[PDB]
Amino acid sequence: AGLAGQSRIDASLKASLLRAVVERQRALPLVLADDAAIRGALLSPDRPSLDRINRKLEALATSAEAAVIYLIDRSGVAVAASNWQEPTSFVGNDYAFRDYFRLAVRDGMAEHFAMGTVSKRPGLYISRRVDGPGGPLGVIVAKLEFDGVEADWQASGKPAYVTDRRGIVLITSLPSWRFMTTKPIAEDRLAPIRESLQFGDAPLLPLPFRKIEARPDGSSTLDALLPGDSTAAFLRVETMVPSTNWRLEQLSPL
Amino acid sequence: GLAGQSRIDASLKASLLRAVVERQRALPLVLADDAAIRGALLSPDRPSLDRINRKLEALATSAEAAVIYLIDRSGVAVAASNWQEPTSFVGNDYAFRDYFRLAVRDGMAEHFAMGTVSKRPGLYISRRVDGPGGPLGVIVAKLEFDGVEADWQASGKPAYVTDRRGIVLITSLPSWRFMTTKPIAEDRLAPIRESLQFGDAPLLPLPFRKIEARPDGSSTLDALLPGDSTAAFLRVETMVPSTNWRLEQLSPL
Ligand SMILES: [Sr+2]
Numbered sequence: 353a354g355l356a357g358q359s360r361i362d363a364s365l366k367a368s369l370l371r372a373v374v375e376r377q378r379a380l381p382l383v384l385a386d387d388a389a390i391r392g393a394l395l396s397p398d399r400p401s402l403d404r405i406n407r408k409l410e411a412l413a414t415s416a417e418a419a420v421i422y423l424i425d426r427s428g429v430a431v432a433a434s435n436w437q438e439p440t441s442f443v444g445n446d447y448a449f450r451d452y453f454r455l456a457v458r459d460g461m462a463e464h465f466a467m468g469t470v471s472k473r474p475g476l477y478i479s480r481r482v483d484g485p486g487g488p489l490g491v492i493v494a495k496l497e498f499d500g501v502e503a504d505w506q507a508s509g510k511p512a513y514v515t516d517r518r519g520i521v522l523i524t525s526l527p528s529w530r531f532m533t534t535k536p537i538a539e540d541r542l543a544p545i546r547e548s549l550q551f552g553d554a555p556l557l558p559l560p561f562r563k564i565e566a567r568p569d570g571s572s573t574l575d576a577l578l579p580g581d582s583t584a585a586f587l588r589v590e591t592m593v594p595s596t597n598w599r600l601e602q603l604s605p606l
Numbered sequence: 607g608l609a610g611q612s613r614i615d616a617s618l619k620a621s622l623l624r625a626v627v628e629r630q631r632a633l634p635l636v637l638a639d640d641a642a643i644r645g646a647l648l649s650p651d652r653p654s655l656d657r658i659n660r661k662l663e664a665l666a667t668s669a670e671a672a673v674i675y676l677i678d679r680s681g682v683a684v685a686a687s688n689w690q691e692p693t694s695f696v697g698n699d700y701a702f703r704d705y706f707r708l709a710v711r712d713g714m715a716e717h718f719a720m721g722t723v724s725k726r727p728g729l730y731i732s733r734r735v736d737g738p739g740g741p742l743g744v745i746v747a748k749l750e751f752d753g754v755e756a757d758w759q760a761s762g763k764p765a766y767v768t769d770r771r772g773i774v775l776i777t778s779l780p781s782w783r784f785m786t787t788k789p790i791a792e793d794r795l796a797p798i799r800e801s802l803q804f805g806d807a808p809l810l811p812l813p814f815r816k817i818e819a820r821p822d823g824s825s826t827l828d829a830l831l832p833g834d835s836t837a838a839f840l841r842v843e844t845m846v847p848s849t850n851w852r853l854e855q856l857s858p859l
């Protein structure tokens with residue numbers, strides 16, 4: 353009852369923190385997608401241009417604490433990247449068939465959660481179409497990672513995780529709960545979801561919960577198996593993360 | 607117990623504050639090198655500043671900034687998100703604001719103050735706009751903290767944030783604002799008031815009796831009331847990451 357009321361307040365904060373973290377990164381493609389020096393680098397991809405966009409993105413990503421920010425031309429090729437001096441530079445890479453690229457071309461913008469193709473680091477890929485004359489010029493992408501939010505949550509003493517509308521856990525204070533589910537999926541649409549996540553190894557098995565008893569709260573009690581130690585008893589509350597289509601759930605130990 | 611958990615909750619408050627602050631820092635960061643903003647400063651014309659007025663207006667809304675504004679090389683504001691308001695900053699002279707001058711010197715500045723007309727406190731976050739051999743201007747976003755404060759109200763554990771002289775800048779209990787936590791001085795009482803643009807400073811101490819330290823770092827404490835009485839409270843302290851601010855939280859027994 354009052355564990356329930358205290359857990360509601362706690363889950364609401366965690367949701368505002370996450371909202372604040374996302375919104376920091378959102379502003380950068382919002383602004384970059386209309387920038388005449390980004391457009392001109394895509395209308396005339398000379399080596400002087402692209403070096404400046406390279407340093408522009410490099411310095412922007414560093415102060416923004418964005419994993420990568422990069423610019424993709426109309427054929428899917430990354431022409432500029434914040435990580436241009438790193439062995440792991442994205443410059444030259446082909447992302448023509450990436451969701452974040454393809455849906456930004458089609459819709460104007462997209463936000464997509466997936467594992468990095470070489471990094472194996474999960475994150476939100478936030479993308480915007482760069483509009484030109486007579487058509488699209490390319491896409492600007494910022495990848496956000498959530499390691500600092502996940503550490504804040506794990507220090508809270510109340511495990512928390514975020515699901516999409518498919519029920520898949522994307523962000524979690526318990527690492528091995530990532531890509532576990534709130535509902536049984538699986539078998540026929542494991543392939544398409546693993547493809548979507550860029551992660552063949554996504555377990556996509558239900559979260560280790562049982563003895564679920566709903567309350568008139570809208571909250572529920574629950575026995576979970578912890579990444580071992582054993583099983584413990586919890587109160588689960590949920591809340592929407594505002595300005596997202598994401599759902600935060602939080603467990604409080606009984 | 608309550609000490610452990612009060613530290614957890616205090617870190618979370620500080621962490622929500624850092625993230626809200628960082629969200630706004632991103633605004634002058636992307637804008638400072640914005641080609642339209644640069645263009646408007648090199649070659650100011652009428653359609654180009656209208657586009658900047660409207661652009662900064664839409665950003666202030668999406669970014670949840672109180673105000674976003676562009677200042678020229680001289681210190682005069684040339685565009686603002688509040689440009690349709692009778693309170694428009696366009697035409698004001700900010701040449702002597704720390705956020706203007708320190709941004710020209712360092713590339714970057716932040717300063718917490720009361721607004722000149724608005725008497726509303728906030729963090730002014732600024733960045734130099736660079737041109738071919740020289741500064742072209744400064745972009746400023748003002749951040750105000752009502753949503754962070756309203757978030758701290760729902761907690762049930764009151765909290766306030768101090769600068770390194772001990773002055774309360776941000777509080778879940780609105781009457782405690784600009785009250786003091788540290789002993790101050792004399793030759794510093796006017797320097798601080800001009801700095802905050804708050805001419806009639808308290809610097810009253812917070813209403814605390816019988817302060818009792820723990821091996822924690824924490825503190826036992828008797829405090830009343832903006833409305834209400836005395837209460838025993840546990841106090842904890844954490845530094846706000848990515849800032850030079852300090853947070854304090856009061857936990858009822
Ligand atoms: Sr979302």
Ligand SMILES: [Sr+2]
Pocket residue numbers: 702703704705800801
């Ligand atoms: Sr000043």
Ligand SMILES: [Sr+2]
Pocket residue numbers: 716849850851
């Ligand atoms: Sr600060």
